[PDB]
Structure formats: C-alpha cells, structure tokens
Amino acid sequence: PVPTGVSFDYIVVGGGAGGIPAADKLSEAGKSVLLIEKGFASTANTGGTLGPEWLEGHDLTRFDVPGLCNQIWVDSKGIACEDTDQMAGCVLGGGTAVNAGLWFKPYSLDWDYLFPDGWKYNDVQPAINRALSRIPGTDAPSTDGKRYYQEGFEVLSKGLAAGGWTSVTANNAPDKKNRTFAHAPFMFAGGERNGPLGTYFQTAKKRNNFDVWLNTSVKRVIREGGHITGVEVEPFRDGGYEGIVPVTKVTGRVILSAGTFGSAKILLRSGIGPEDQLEVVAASEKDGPTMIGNSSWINLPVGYNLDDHLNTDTVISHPDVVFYDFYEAWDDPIESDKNSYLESRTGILAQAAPNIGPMFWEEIVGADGIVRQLQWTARVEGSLGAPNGHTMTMSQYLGRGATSRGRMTITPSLTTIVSDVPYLKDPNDKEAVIQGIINLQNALQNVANLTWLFPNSTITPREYVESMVVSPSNRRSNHWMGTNKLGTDDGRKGGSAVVDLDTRVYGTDNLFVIDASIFPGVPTTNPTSYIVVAAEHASSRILALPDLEPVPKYGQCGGREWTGSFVCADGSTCEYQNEWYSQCL
Numbered sequence: 001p002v003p004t005g006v007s008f009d010y011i012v013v014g015g016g017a018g019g020i021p022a023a024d025k026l027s028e029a030g031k032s033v034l035l036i037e038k039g040f041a042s043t044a045n046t047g048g049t050l051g052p053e054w055l056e057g058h059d060l061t062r063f064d065v066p067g068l069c070n071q072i073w074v075d076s077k078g079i080a081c082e083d084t085d086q087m088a089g090c091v092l093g094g095g096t097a098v099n100a101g102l103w104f105k106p107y108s109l110d111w112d113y114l115f116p117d118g119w120k121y122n123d124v125q126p127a128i129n130r131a132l133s134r135i136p137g138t139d140a141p142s143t144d145g146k147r148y149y150q151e152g153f154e155v156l157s158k159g160l161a162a163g164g165w166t167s168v169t170a171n172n173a174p175d176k177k178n179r180t181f182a183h184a185p186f187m188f189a190g191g192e193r194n195g196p197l198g199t200y201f202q203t204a205k206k207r208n209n210f211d212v213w214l215n216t217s218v219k220r221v222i223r224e225g226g227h228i229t230g231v232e233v234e235p236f237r238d239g240g241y242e243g244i245v246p247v248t249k250v251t252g253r254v255i256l257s258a259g260t261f262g263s264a265k266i267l268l269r270s271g272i273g274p275e276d277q278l279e280v281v282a283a284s285e286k287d288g289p290t291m292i293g294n295s296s297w298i299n300l301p302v303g304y305n306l307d308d309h310l311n312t313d314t315v316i317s318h319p320d321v322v323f324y325d326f327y328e329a330w331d332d333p334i335e336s337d338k339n340s341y342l343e344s345r346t347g348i349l350a351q352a353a354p355n356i357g358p359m360f361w362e363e364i365v366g367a368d369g370i371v372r373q374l375q376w377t378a379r380v381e382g383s384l385g386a387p388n389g390h391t392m393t394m395s396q397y398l399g400r401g402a403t404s405r406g407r408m409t410i411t412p413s414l415t416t417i418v419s420d421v422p423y424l425k426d427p428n429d430k431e432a433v434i435q436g437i438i439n440l441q442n443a444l445q446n447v448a449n450l451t452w453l454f455p456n457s458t459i460t461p462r463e464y465v466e467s468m469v470v471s472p473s474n475r476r477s478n479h480w481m482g483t484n485k486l487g488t489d490d491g492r493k494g495g496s497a498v499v500d501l502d503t504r505v506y507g508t509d510n511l512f513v514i515d516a517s518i519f520p521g522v523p524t525t526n527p528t529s530y531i532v533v534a535a536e537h538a539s540s541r542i543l544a545l546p547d548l549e550p551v552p553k554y555g556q557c558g559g560r561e562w563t564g565s566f567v568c569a570d571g572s573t574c575e576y577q578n579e580w581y582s583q584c585l
C-alpha cells in the first residue's frame with residue numbers, strides 16, 4: 001500500500017552488489033533514496049533471523065557464517081530467485097548475501113580491455129580506491145589471522161611454485177594475473193560475511209534520507225515517453241508494497257540494480273528491449289493488458305551480449321589433502337569448531353565452504369593474437385563425481401578476452417531463460433581452455449603421489465574438454481553479465497549498447513542501470529568487487545550530472561534519435577507525433 005504523498009530523488013531497484021553501494025553513495029549525497037528489494041532481511045546486521053539452531057541467540061544467521069555458504073546449493077527455497085533458469089540470490093544483499101565472498105582488487109587490464117573511455121582503468125581507479133577502502137579483502141578471514149585445513153593448499157601451492165608459478169598476495173598485486181597463485185581473498189570482516197551488507201548498507205541505513213522496502217518486487221517503470229515518472233510495485237511477500245511510487249518531479253531518477261536477468265526483465269516489462277521480446281511481453285497473460293503501448297517502445301539489445309565465465313572443472317587426489325564437511329556443519333557442526341567460531345570468530349568456519357584453496361591465474365595468447373584470461377579456483381571437494389575425501393577441485397574460469405556471447409530472452413510466463421548458450425562459440429576460446437589444463441598439468445607434474453582423476457591419465461586435455469557438454473547447467477560460473485550493455489553505440493540505431501557512459505538507458509532522461517548487466521564482458525576474476533566498483537563509479541557520474549531541464553512548450557521532447565529531456569515544462573505535456581518526433585503541447 002504505497003503512501004499518499006511520498007516521492008524520492010532516487011529509487012534504486014534491487015539490493016544486490018550493484019544496488020546497495022549505489023543507494024549508499026546516492027543517499028550520502030543528501031538526496032532522498034528509496035531502495036526497493038524483492039527479498040527479505042538476510043545477515044543479522046540487516047535484521048535477518050534465518051538460520052540453523054546452533055546459531056540461535058548468538059546474533060548470527062546462515063548468511064553471516066562463511067562455512068555455511070554452501071547450504072544455498074542444497075537448501076535454496078525462498079532464497080533463490082524463481083523467475084530465472086539460473087542461480088541468483090533473491091534476498092537482501094542479492095548475490096553478495098549468498099555467494100562465496102571472494103573479493104578481488106581489479107586487474108587494470110579488465111577495465112582497459114572491456115570498457116570504453118570514461119570507464120577505462122584511469123577512469124575507475126578512484127572508484128576502485130573507494131570500494132577497497134570500504135571493503136579491503138582478507139585472505140585469512142579467521143580473526144586470529146591463522147588459516148585452517150591448509151593441507152590441500154600447501155599441496156597445490158608448493159606444486160605450482162616448482163612449476164614456475166609465483167606466489168602473490170592477490171589484492172596487493174592486483175595486476176599480476178599471469179602465472180600467479182595466491183591465498184583466496186574474501187570480503188569478510190570480523191569472521192563474518194560482511195561485504196556490501198556489512199559496509200555500504202550499514203552506513204546507508206543510518207540516514208533519514210534513506211528508506212528500504214523489503215519484500216517488494218518492481219514490476220516495471222511507469223513512463224510518459226522517455227521520462228520515467230515512477231516505479232510499479234507489488235508485494236513479493238507480506239509487508240511488501242502494492243502501488244506506484246513516484247520519483248521527484250522532473251528531477252528524479254530510477255536506478256535498475258535488479259541483476260543481469262532482473263534488470264533486463266524490468267526493462268522488457270517497461271517496453272524497452274528487442275521488438276520480438278517486447279512482443280512476447282505484450283502477448284503475455286500477466287502483462288499483456290497493462291503494458292505500455294507499442295508506439296512508446298524503445299528498441300535496445302536488452303538480453304543480448306549475455307556473458308559468463310566458462311567453467312571447466314578439473315579434479316586431483318592427493319594423500320595429504322584433508323576434506324572438511326561443510327554440509328554436516330549446517331546441522332551437526334564439529335563442536336570445537338562451533339565453539340571457536342561462536343566465542344572467538346576463528347577456525348575453519350570463518351573460512352568459506354568448501355575449503356577454498358590456492359587461487360591462481362594465467363594469460364594465454366591465442367592464434368588470433370587475442371590474450372585470453374584464465375582463473376583457477378582450487379577448493380577441497382569432489383566435483384565430477386569424484387569422492388569427497390582426498391580430492392581437490394580445480395575450476396578453470398575462462399574470462400576477459402573470450403569472444404563468445406549468448407542471449408537472454410523472456411518467457412510468456414515473464415521468466416528469463418538463457419536461450420542462446422554463450423560459451424565456446426569461437427574455436428580460439430576452446431583452445432585457451434585446453435591449453436590451460438595442459439599448462440596446469442605441467443606445473444603439477446612434479447608433485448609426488450598427486451593423481452589426476454579428471455581428466456584421468458588416459459584422456460588427453462583436448463579429449464577431456466571435447467567430451468564435456470556445453471551448457472549452463474554444468475558449465476556456468478554464476479557470473480552472468482552483459483544483458484544491458486554499456487557503450488557509446490546507441491542501441492536504437494542498431495548498436496550494442498543499452499546504456500550510455502552515465503549508465504542512462506538510451507531513449508530516457510532519468511533511467512539508469514547499475515549492476516552486472518552493463519558489463520561488456522566478464523573480468524579476470526569473481527565479479528562482485530568489480531560490480532561494486534562500477535557502482536562507486538556510476539553513482540559519481542550520475543551525481544555530477546546537472547539537474548534535468550524540462551523542455552519549453554512546443555519544443556521537441558522525444559523521438560527515436562532524441563538525446564535530451566523527455567519531460568515537459570509545467571503547462572504542457574509530451575505528445576508523440578511519430579517515431580522521430582514528440583513535442584511539448
């Protein structure tokens with residue numbers, strides 16, 4: 001039930017990695033900010049209560065404890081988003097509430113390579129410095145600075161060093177991403193998940209010019225032509241709001257932080273995206289009758305440029321490797337570990353599940369002269385059906401420089417699907433994957449008693465890869481990006497860009513997108529830190545824009561090539577004439 005007289009300078013939709021820092025920075029500016037979130041309170045510091053019984057009374061939830069982070073894989077109900085075919089957090093904090101918490105200071109090349117000018121490394125470096133001040137990493141999240149069950153790590157790390165790879169502290173040497181290995185850095189603090197929920201959101205929630213609406217889903221933005229007047233909400237759970245909440249007249253702005261799939265969905269429901277997809281929404285049961293008319297539609301490649309890390313698992317077994325069962329930690333945690341975590345915030349439970357071992361990287365020049373970026377995540381766990389005890393999984397991510405891309409589309413149910421699988425469309429992407437496995441095998445070839453289970457010694461790396469099914473189900477990294485791509489090439493004219501350098505949606509004066517969806521591709525690394533940095537950076541670009549200026553009566557307020565204000569001065573309205581012209585009348 002949305003209140004009589006309330007409006008906001010900024011409305012930020014979605015409480016994830018993009019939305020929380022954006023809403024924090026914008027409310028820090030003194031502007032009035034409303035953060036609308038689908039899900040409910042998650043970590044205890046947001047007032048979340050949800051978790052196992054051994055946490056009861058200890059001021060902790062399932063979202064606070066690093067060693068419980070893998071529960072999401074066996075118990076996601078009411079937490080994971082249901083309007084997508086992939087894995088996403090639909091609680092407050094979004095993906096940062098449920099992810100493994102890996103946190104990386106950006107590799108400069110990622111911004112220089114992926115982004116146009118104004119977003120290159122020189123441009124976002126102040127933003128990088130802000131994000132890493134708010135959240136420095138720690139590669140030793142146990143509050144005593146000790147690390148636990150490192151047997152496996154020491155196995156692989158010693159192996160790698162002998163193979164010619166160099167130890168770094170990853171976030172002290174962000175740019176050393178080639179033939180490098182490191183202790184895994186996390187956004188944890190005080191032995192707890194922390195992150196954006198622990199920093200950005202906490203400073204925000206203290207401000208009286210800041211408001212959060214939980215349990216509230218944004219159906220779409222309401223707009224007259226290219227000017228968004230408000231956002232339309234319905235309760236996702238009891239205590240959510242039903243209605244249309246306005247933004248400050250003329251001057252007010254909306255930011256879509258709902259995620260690569262969620263923000264794209266909202267745009268489509270708002271009559272922004274490819275014709276065929278808008279036409280799907282228009283035909284739909286839920287939205288057909290109330291959708292904005294097809295003459296107000298803005299055609300942008302929403303859902304194109306779908307990107308993710310290509311994940312390829314590898315498994316080894318070594319006798320010194322010690323498995324820890326983080327799943328049995330949900331119900332019946334080993335008591336001394338329960339104890340050191342609850343009293344001291346120390347021990348294996350202050351580390352993310354499963355035990356996340358050496359982190360390492362290399363860059364491989366392909367036949368096309370394109371440098372492709374590999375990241376490996378070693379963790380102590382079976383993967384391909386290898387048994388859990390002495391195994392370690394080594395997961396290769398194919399990152400920046402990969403050329404393959406997919407597409408997201410929307411169902412008649414208004415749920416999103418990955419309908420064009422992104423991975424390995426281009427042969428040189430595959431070559432990098434194969435070469436990386438070969439390269440790793442070379443590094444680890446002198447390690448005694450080390451066994452290759454996956455691929456086993458009788459299968460070549462090429463054969464091993466060639467055998468694998470290429471599908472999001474077994475190959476996704478849950479790093480989905482790119483559906484609202486940021487760029488200078490206006491999508492209305494056939495370009496690939498959904499939003500411009502200020503993250504403004506082409507065809508609008510006040511609508512912006514800050515989340516994973518704007519990245520032209522995936523970075524070297526687990527993307528959360530990058531997404532926070534992009535929010536630091538985008539919110540500053542937005543904050544430095546001059547206030548929007550209404551058009552005088554008879555002036556042009558719209559059209560398919562219009563760059564300007566879409567909103568009219570008092571005493572006139574924007575009126576559509578044709579696809580190239582709207583006038584204030």
Ligand SMILES: Cc1cc2nc3c(=O)[nH]c(=O)nc-3n(C[C@H](O)[C@H](O)[C@H](O)COP(=O)(O)OP(=O)(O)OC[C@H]3O[C@@H](n4cnc5c(N)ncnc54)[C@H](O)[C@@H]3O)c2cc1C
Pocket residue numbers: 013014015016017018019036037038039072087088089090091092093094095096098099100101102103216217218219257258259260262263266478479480514515516517525526527528529531
């Ligand atoms: C479990 C898993 C493991 C991962 N591990 C790592 C890791 O260790 N480190 C790393 O850097 N990254 C990791 N990631 C990647 C990461 O979680 C995402 O890339 C990142 O959090 C996405 O940022 P976002 O702002 O675009 O979207 P999100 O974080 O998903 O935020 C979207 C938010 O908007 C809300 N929302 C969505 N639609 C609507 C709507 N219509 N109305 C209102 N609210 C809405 C959602 O509930 C959610 O809170 C992992 C993620 C997964 C799922």
Ligand SMILES: *[C@@H]1O[C@H](CO)[C@@H](O[C@@H]2O[C@H](CO)[C@@H](O)[C@H](O)[C@H]2NC(C)=O)[C@H](O)[C@H]1NC(C)=O
Pocket residue numbers: 039040041048049050214215237238239240
């Ligand atoms: C959002 O919805 C959640 C879940 O429906 C509400 O959280 C529950 O609140 C009741 C009583 O207030 C508690 O007994 C439950 O333990 C809570 N569950 C969880 C998972 O937190 C929450 O109150 C709602 N929030 C708002 C603002 O309406």
Ligand SMILES: *[C@@H]1O[C@H](CO)[C@@H](O[C@@H]2O[C@H](CO)[C@@H](O)[C@H](O)[C@H]2NC(C)=O)[C@H](O)[C@H]1NC(C)=O
Pocket residue numbers: 178179362363364365371
């Ligand atoms: C990353 O480091 C490795 C090793 O330092 C580089 O490997 C060299 O690659 C060139 C061709 O790309 C070969 O001709 C050399 O013989 C390789 N040297 C070794 C020791 O393997 C690799 O090129 C580096 N990657 C990038 C992108 O700079």
Ligand SMILES: O=C1N[C@H](CO)[C@@H](O[C@@H]2O[C@H](CO)[C@@H](O)[C@H](O)[C@H]2O)[C@H](O)[C@H]1O
Pocket residue numbers: 070073100102353354356377379381476477478479526
């Ligand atoms: O960034 C990530 N970080 C973590 C850690 O690297 C990954 O979690 C892994 O995700 C796998 C599922 O894809 C699980 O089988 C595995 O146990 C779990 O640790 C996650 O899928 C990936 O997106």
